[PDB]
Amino acid sequence: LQNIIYNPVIPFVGTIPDQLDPGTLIVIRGHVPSDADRFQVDLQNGSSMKPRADVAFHFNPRFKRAGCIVCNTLINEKWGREEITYDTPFKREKSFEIVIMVLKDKFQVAVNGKHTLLYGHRIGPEKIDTLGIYGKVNIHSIGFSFSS
Ligand SMILES: O=c1c2ccccc2c(-c2ccc(Br)cc2)nn1CO[C@@H]1C=CO[C@H](CO)[C@@H]1O
Ligand SMILES: [Cl-]
DSSP: OEEEEESOOSSEEEEOSSOOOTTOEEEEEEEOOTTOOBEEEEEEESOOTTTTOEEEEEEEEEOSTTOEEEEEEEETTEEOOOEEEOOOOOOTTOEEEEEEEEOSSEEEEEETTEEEEEEEOSSOGGGOOEEEEEESOEEEEEEEEOOO
């Protein structure tokens, strides 16, 4: 595991230094502030703002009501079909560790050691070169364990 950054200012946008081949792990440690409505981790094809970079995997915990996680893909500035997970491990004022495991056909995400969700690839993961973190969240570290 090689961290590309510790204690980043949010929003954070950084280049991923190698390809997300099957078997790659992405590890993100952080904490949800007590007033958060949402945050997201986006695996992107570049960092353009105008027009907005494609988002292969948008991982979006939301804290209203019972809480949920929304996952989606942005292609050519259009969102696709939301996949919503209602069994969410995130909570306001609680710390987490996210592990994203890149498989051949999907991502598999676990939080605090416990399986959270799966998300099938809609953009080839080879096209991902950038990681962004947005919203109301405190991040301790972002790192990669590359299968290369
Ligand atoms: O709600 C936000 C948001 C909130 C705080 C900070 C950033 C954002 C951003 C945002 C915009 C550009 C860039 Br670059 C990075 C983040 N988008 N949305 C909007 O998020 C969407 C709203 C509804 O559903 C979509 C998923 O289906 C998505 O969550
Ligand atoms: Cl697979």
